[PDB]
Write an enzyme that holds these catalytic residues in place. Structure first.
Site, PDB file in Angstrom:
ATOM      1  N   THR A 114       1.036  -1.028  -0.075  1.00 22.10           N
ATOM      2  CA  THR A 114      -0.142  -0.078   0.119  1.00 22.10           C
ATOM      3  C   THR A 114       0.935   1.103  -0.432  1.00 22.10           C
ATOM      4  OG1 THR A 114      -0.721  -0.037   2.616  1.00 22.10           O
ATOM      5  CG2 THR A 114      -1.871  -0.894   0.722  1.00 22.10           C
ATOM      6  N   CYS A 115       1.839   1.588   0.728  1.00 26.13           N
ATOM      7  CA  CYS A 115       2.354   2.720   1.153  1.00 26.13           C
ATOM      8  C   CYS A 115       3.201   2.667   0.494  1.00 26.13           C
ATOM      9  CB  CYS A 115       3.145   2.970   2.786  1.00 26.13           C
ATOM     10  SG  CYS A 115       2.183   2.758   3.607  1.00 26.13           S
ATOM     11  N   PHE A 116       3.504   2.000  -0.813  1.00 25.78           N
ATOM     12  CA  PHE A 116       4.453   2.235  -1.745  1.00 25.78           C
ATOM     13  C   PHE A 116       3.923   0.409  -2.352  1.00 25.78           C
ATOM     14  CE2 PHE A 116       7.443   1.443   1.599  1.00 25.78           C
ATOM     15  CZ  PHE A 116       8.170   3.007   1.585  1.00 25.78           C
TER      16      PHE A 116
END
Ligand SMILES: [Zn+2]
Ligand SMILES: [Zn+2]
Ligand SMILES: [Zn+2]
Ligand SMILES: [Zn+2]
Ligand SMILES: [Zn+2]
EC number: 2.3.2.26
Lengths: 76, 115
Positions: free
Chosen positions: B86-88
């Protein structure tokens, strides 16, 4: 003892567990009957998540209790 | 409901897969066969949101800026489910043995919701 594991919105399995077992052992048995790796599992007993280090007795899990299994497939 | 899969495929980075890897071909083949609702479920699974940028997937974000979608090879087990970071905007994809297994595990991963 003997508990049940309801997985998401689907099947339900049975497990022969002792109160001294850790949650990691329960997730290992869930892996033995389901194939889901333990690191991708999270167990819920009526609201609260179950930490891997604790035991079934710490959460006061009586016999024939139904744990709710959720997949841990997302993070940051 | 508007997913130019060629645009997402042309803006996808790989490691340690290659663009012509068999699991990558199976991945785009399986993602092509999904409904727009299932493609939105995959976008939410990988990026946390189903919205598409106005400039296409080349302007995909991203915590601190533009972060293109990226598929990574999970070298741990062929019997484990896909995972996302998610974050990446990254999808962890194991080296599944068949296209049917990849599509089945992908659908099983994206169709788990409410959490
Ligand atoms: Zn085992
Ligand atoms: Zn994890
Ligand atoms: Zn990962
Ligand atoms: Zn078949
Ligand atoms: Zn099938």
């Amino acid at each position: 003892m003997q508990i049940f594991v309801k997985t998401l919105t689907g099947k339900t399995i049975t497990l022969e567990v002792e109160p001294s077992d850790t949650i990691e052992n329960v997730k290992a048995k869930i892996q033995d009957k389901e194939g889901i790796p333990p690191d991708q599992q999270r167990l819920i007993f009526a609201g609260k998540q179950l930490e891997d280090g604790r035991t079934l007795s710490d959460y006061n899990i009586q016999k024939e209790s139904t744990l709710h299994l959720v997949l841990r497939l997302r993070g940051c | 409901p508007t997913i130019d899969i060629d645009d997402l495929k042309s803006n996808t980075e790989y490691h340690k897969y290659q663009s012509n890897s068999i699991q990558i071909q199976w991945f785009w083949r399986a993602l092509r066969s999904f409904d727009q609702a299932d493609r939105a479920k995959f976008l939410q699974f990988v990026t946390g949101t189903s919205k598409v940028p106005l400039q296409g997937f080349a302007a995909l974000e991203g915590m601190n800026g533009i972060q293109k979608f990226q598929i990574h090879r999970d070298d741990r087990s062929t019997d484990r489910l896909p995972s996302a970071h998610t974050c990446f905007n990254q999808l962890d994809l194991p080296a599944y043995e068949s296209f049917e297994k990849l599509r089945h595990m992908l659908l099983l991963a994206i169709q788990e919701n409410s959490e």
